[PDB]
């Protein structure tokens, strides 16, 4: 059921075939898919973290800029 | 499978698949490479997609930010932006995995009833969802006008239709 | 001198006068100064953190979208 | 003050100012409230400001991303975006503190020589800096067409001129 836990699957897709690698987190790094990795974590979607008020800044923006269209 | 276990584990600690494990994983879903690019098109633009969608809900119905509107205070606006992101992330996982079972079970089952209990307006939710659907289809198909994505030349129409169906499951559950 | 360690002053200006408060890190969130705070740290400007490739994503965007004008 | 000691401390760990201490901080600089709003305009929009500036450099000279180009690889483009952010952040601290001593000492002293040794081109830096200056001034003066700031109506012209002078110090040091 929807558990009211605000948890959601965070999927991150990495393509580092340019050669600038991030932290090693998976053991398979050789062959055709060298440089490619997918991560999934199941965690709370928080308003902010690490001192960074991510969603609060987005909220401030809506109130003042909802009349703007960032898609064009 | 590695990822299914993340959904059900006690702490949701991240799992990672690369190289030969990822090659194997892509064999179990259709159009594996384009599918990864389509998922990336969602998650790498999560803030943009949520912002534009909630902003369009408000611009079409500014009473939502009038006193006693659904998103009048920053606290409520942020909760709404959060929920839109939660939904979007469950949709992204549905596209990664090729089905909607986790979305249905852990995001949608009980959600309409919770929103009724809270007084969260269904019309506003429907519009945030329909804009998120349109925005995601735009990014997947590289028809986003301010932010294109680099991918090998081709056609992602089938994956766009698939993701649209997952958004349609959200809409139908919350109507 | 410039130390070649990429450390810069991170200034964060908080205005939470809407009433939704973040974590308390100083006295004074009361009276005429309700909701206002300034933070400064001196730390490396990293390419990413916490698994989020912040500057790598910005670089990908430039390669494809340098012909777009996000200011209009 | 306490923020000066953060700059010079061995570990740079954060310090915070609120309440009466924030009232005192604002007295010792001119136009304290508008100044805090101006610093906020810079740091809250740091990704946008840096992105538009470096993107402007590239669109005025697309050879920079072709093979044999100075930001051709992702690694180099990211180093350039990082450097633009470092400079912007030293400028933000100059506007917070009311002077440019830390910018000149810890960011600019030695930087022209370092870029010469690395082959970081002065003309590209000049354009990135000039766009960043114009962008920051635009944000501070209600000339940001895709992002309005919430501030009481009024005249931030002096603060825009001040921050312009800090950018001019960067330009002159790196020319
Ligand atoms: C971060 C946003 C973004 C970037 C960057 C980009 O390149 N594309 C982006 C978003 C995007 N939006 C849509 C479609 C819609 N967006 C809205 C909301 C805005 N329209 C308004 O009238 C309004 C208030 C002033 C907004 C805010 C709407 C309503 C839609 C269409 C919904 C529908 O039923 O059709 C897309 C899809 C592709 C396109 O450009 O049309 C994208 C990619
Ligand atoms: C995140 C960017 C942004 C938002 C959001 C907003 O509301 N304003 C924003 C940016 C902004 N940019 C400028 C000025 C300039 N930006 C550029 C680069 C773009 N022009 C291009 O030709 C190019 C590639 C094709 C770009 C990328 C340039 C060149 C300028 C002008 C600099 C100058 O010498 O004057 C501003 C300042 C206000 C303005 O509109 O000029 C702002 C706020
Ligand atoms: C309510 C849930 C809001 C929301 C607020 C957030 N603020 C966050 C970070 C933050 N806020 C302050 C200012 C506050 N603390 C003080 O001590 C004083 C005055 C003395 C004030 C005015 C600070 C200093 C911080 C950073 C904390 C730090 O340095 O670690 C924040 C991020 C929380 C976190 O990172 O853990 C949030 C979510 N955000 C929202 O979306 C709603 C509207
Ligand atoms: C719709 C989404 C796009 C479109 C996508 C295409 N991608 C194609 C090939 C491709 N993409 C990747 C990267 C991808 N695979 C992964 O495992 C991960 C990260 C974990 C990512 C980000 C790869 C490796 C490939 C194979 C070829 C290559 O190396 O470049 C592709 C070509 C057809 C196909 O391979 O099925 C397409 C069409 N292209 C578009 O034009 C729309 C907008
Ligand atoms: C080089 C400096 C680049 C850049 C790279 C970054 N990548 C970041 C995070 C990241 N990258 C991967 C994929 C990589 N790890 C693997 O094990 C494999 C395959 C087996 C690959 C292809 C992952 C999994 C991660 C997340 C790490 C995590 O979950 O903690 C990253 C953020 C670093 C961090 O969060 O500490 C960066 C900066 N960024 C750039 O700007 C240049 C171009
Ligand atoms: C140019 C930068 C803008 C402009 C800004 C104005 N701000 C004015 C007054 C004001 N701003 C704040 C918030 C500020 N002070 C803090 O301590 C902090 C956080 C630590 C911040 C974010 C306050 C508290 C005030 C006093 C008024 C109030 O109580 O809201 C202002 C009025 C003139 C003045 O007080 O000097 C202006 C013009 N306005 C513009 O049109 C440009 C775009
Ligand atoms: C945005 C398009 C909406 C809007 C959304 C609001 N949701 C509010 C609170 C809320 N949302 C949920 C569901 C969320 N939690 C989960 O665990 C999951 C899925 C796993 C989801 C999608 C819950 C359980 C809650 C209540 C508990 C909480 O706040 O975390 C909310 C605040 C309501 C209030 O406090 O009165 C809002 C504003 N509101 C709108 O008007 C638009 C249509
Ligand atoms: C962007 C507008 C430029 C551009 C910038 C590049 N800088 C590169 C390496 C680099 N930058 C610095 C200065 C930086 N480190 C600091 O500690 C401080 C201030 C406290 C700053 C401003 C250093 C010391 C270095 C080398 C060490 C490092 O990488 O951290 C760089 C990579 C060059 C290379 O590796 O060959 C670039 C691309 N490049 C351009 O084309 C435009 C004009």
3-state secondary structure D44-59: HCHHHHHHHHHHHHHH
Q: Which residues contact C3 (CB under 8 A, 6 or more apart)?
A: D106
Rounded to 5, what percent of chain B is helix, strand, coil? 70, 0, 25
Q: Which residues contact D125 (CB under 8 A, 6 or more apart)?
A: D115, D174
Resolution of the structure, angstroms: 1.5
Specify the DSSP class assigned to residue A3: -
Residues of A with Cβ-Cβ distance to B152 under 8 angstroms: none
**In chain A, domain spans:** 7-65
Angle subtended by helix axes B19-26 and B32-43, to nearest 10: 100
The candidate with the shortest Cα–Cα distance to B106, out of D20, A11, D120, A9, is A9
CB atoms inside a 10 Å sphere around CB A32: 10
How far is the C-alpha of A23 from the C-alpha of A19, rounded, in Å?
13
Specify the DSSP class assigned to residue C35: T
CA angle D84, C1, D166 (to 5 degrees): 45
Give chain D's radius of gyration (CA, Å). Answer: 17
List strand residue ranges (DSSP E) for B89-133, in order: none
Which residue of D74, D147, D150 is in closest CB contact with A18? D74
How far is the C-alpha of D111 from the C-alpha of A6, rounded, in Å?
46
D107 min Cα distance to partner chain C (Å): 5
CB atoms inside a 10 Å sphere around CB A11: 22
Complete edge-to-edge strand list for the sheet that includes strand C7-15:
C7-15, C36-44, D15-18
Q: Which residue has the tokens 């001129």?
A: D161
List strand residue ranges (DSSP E) for chain D, in order: 15-18
How far is the C-alpha of B15 from the C-alpha of A65, rounded, in Å?
37
Angle subtended by helix axes D32-44 and D122-140, to nearest 10: 130
Compute CA distances A67 → B14, B115, D9, whole Å. Answer: 38, 26, 45
Phi first, then psi: give them for residue A13, nearest 5 degrees. -115, 120
How far is the C-alpha of D144 from the C-alpha of D130, rounded, in Å?
16
Compute CA distances B130 → B23, B102, B104, B123, whole Å. Answer: 33, 20, 18, 11
Contact between B52 and B131 (Cβ < 8 Å): yes
At CB < 8 A and 24+ separation, what contacts does B161-167 make?
B162/B95, B162/B98, B163/B38, B163/B42, B163/B91, B163/B94, B163/B95, B163/B133, B163/B136, B163/B137, B164/B133, B164/B137, B165/B100, B166/B91, B166/B94, B166/B95, B166/B100, B166/B103, B167/B91, B167/B129, B167/B130, B167/B132, B167/B133, B167/B136
Residues in chain B: 175
Residue of C nearest to B75 (CA): C20
How far is the C-alpha of D61 from the C-alpha of D47, rounded, in Å?
21
How far is the C-alpha of B58 from the C-alpha of B127, rounded, in Å?
9
How far is the C-alpha of A40 from the C-alpha of A45, rounded, in Å?
14
Token pair in block for residue D133: 């200056």
Residues of D with Cβ-Cβ distance to C37 under 8 angstroms: 16-18, 22
The candidate with the shortest Cα–Cα distance to D8, out of D83, D82, D97, is D97
Mutate to test the interface with C, among D17, D23, D145 (most CBs of C within 10 A): D17
| Chain D stretch 13-32, residues whose beta carbon is closer than 8 A to a beta carbon of chain C | 13-23, 25
Q: Which residues of D30-62 are buried (b: 16+ CB within 10 A; e: fewer)?
A: ebbebbbbbbbbbbbbbebbbbbbbbbbbeebe
Compute CA distances B135 → A27, B132, C57, whole Å. Answer: 35, 5, 19
CB atoms inside a 10 Å sphere around CB C44: 14
- The technique by which this structure was obtained is X-ray
CB atoms inside a 10 Å sphere around CB D116: 12
How far is the C-alpha of A29 from the C-alpha of A14, rounded, in Å?
12
Task: Name the burial class of residue B68, with classes exposed (0-12), middle (13-18) and buried (19+) by CB atoms within 10 angstroms of its CB.
Answer: exposed
Q: Which residues contact C59 (CB under 8 A, 6 or more apart)?
A: D74, D77, D78, D81
Q: Which of helix, strand or coil describes residue A15?
A: strand
Task: Name the burial class of residue B83, with classes exposed (0-12), middle (13-18) and buried (19+) by CB atoms within 10 angstroms of its CB.
Answer: buried
**CATH code of the domain made up of A7-65:** 3.90.510.10
The candidate with the shortest Cα–Cα distance to D81, out of D123, D111, D48, D107, is D48
Contact between D84 and D46 (Cβ < 8 Å): no
Exposure of D90 in the CB half-sphere (CA atoms within 13 A): 26
How far is the C-alpha of A20 from the C-alpha of D161, rounded, in Å?
40
Token pair in block for residue B121: 């307006």
For chain A, say whether C21 makes contact (Cβ under 8 Å).
no
Contact between B125 and B167 (Cβ < 8 Å): no
CA angle A17, A20, A21 (to 5 degrees): 85
Specify the DSSP class assigned to residue B108: I
Specify the DSSP class assigned to residue A52: B
Q: Which residues contact A52 (CB under 8 A, 6 or more apart)?
A: none
How far is the C-alpha of D136 from the C-alpha of D39, rounded, in Å?
10
DSSP bridge pairs for C15: C36
Residue of B nearest to C53 (CA): B44
Q: Which residue has the tokens 């949701």?
A: B12
Q: What would be the CATH architecture of the domain defined by B1-175?
A: Orthogonal Bundle (1.10)
Contact between D49 and D136 (Cβ < 8 Å): yes
How far is the C-alpha of C34 from the C-alpha of C24, rounded, in Å?
12
Residue of A nearest to C38 (CA): A51
How close are the terminal C-alpha atoms of chain D, in Å? 32
How far is the C-alpha of D133 from the C-alpha of D135, rounded, in Å?
5
CA angle D99, D100, D104 (to 5 degrees): 160
Q: Which residue has the tokens 């010792």?
A: D28
Q: Which residue has the tokens 């830096």?
A: D125
Q: Which residues contact B67 (CB under 8 A, 6 or more apart)?
A: none
Q: Do A11 and B18 touch (CB under 8 A)?
A: no
For chain A, say whether D142 makes contact (Cβ under 8 Å).
no
Residue B126 CA to its chain's centroid (Å): 13
Compute CA distances B36 → B22, B27, B92, B93, whole Å. Answer: 10, 12, 10, 11
Report how far ligand 2's centroid is from the alpha carbon of A71 (Å). Answer: 16
Q: Which of helix, strand or coil describes residue D18?
A: strand
DSSP bridge pairs for D18: C37
Nearest ligand to the CA atom of C13:
6
DSSP bridge pairs for D104: none
How far is the C-alpha of B172 from the C-alpha of B167, rounded, in Å?
9
């Amino acid at each position: 059921a929807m558990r009211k836990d605000a948890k959601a699957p965070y999927v991150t897709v990495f393509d580092e075939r340019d050669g600038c690698g991030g932290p090693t987190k998976a053991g398979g790094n050789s062959g055709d898919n060298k440089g490619l990795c997918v991560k999934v974590a199941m965690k709370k979607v928080a308003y902010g973290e690490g001192g960074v008020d991510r969603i609060g800044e987005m909220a401030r923006d809506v109130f003042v800029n909802y009349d703007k269209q960032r898609g064009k | 499978d590695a990822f299914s276990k993340v959904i059900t584990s006690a702490d949701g600690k991240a799992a990672y698949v690369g190289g030969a494990d990822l090659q194997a994983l892509k064999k179990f879903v259709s159009e594996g490479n384009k599918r990864m690019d389509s998922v990336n098109a969602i998650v790498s633009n999560a803030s943009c997609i949520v912002s534009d969608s909630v902003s369009g809900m408000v611009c079409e119905n500014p009473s939502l930010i009038a006193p006693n509107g659904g998103v009048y205070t920053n606290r409520k606006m942020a909760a709404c932006l959060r929920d839109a992101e939660i939904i979007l992330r469950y949709v992204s996982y549905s596209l990664l995995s090729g089905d909607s079972s986790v979305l249905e079970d852990r995001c949608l089952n009980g959600l309409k009833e919770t929103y009724a209990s809270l007084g969260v307006p269904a019309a506003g939710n429907a519009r945030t969802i329909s804009i998120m659907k349109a925005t995601v289809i735009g990014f997947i198909t590289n028809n986003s006008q301010q932010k294109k994505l680099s991918t090998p030349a081709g056609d992602c129409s089938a994956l766009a239709s698939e993701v649209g169906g997952y958004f349609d499951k959200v809409s139908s559950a919350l109507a």
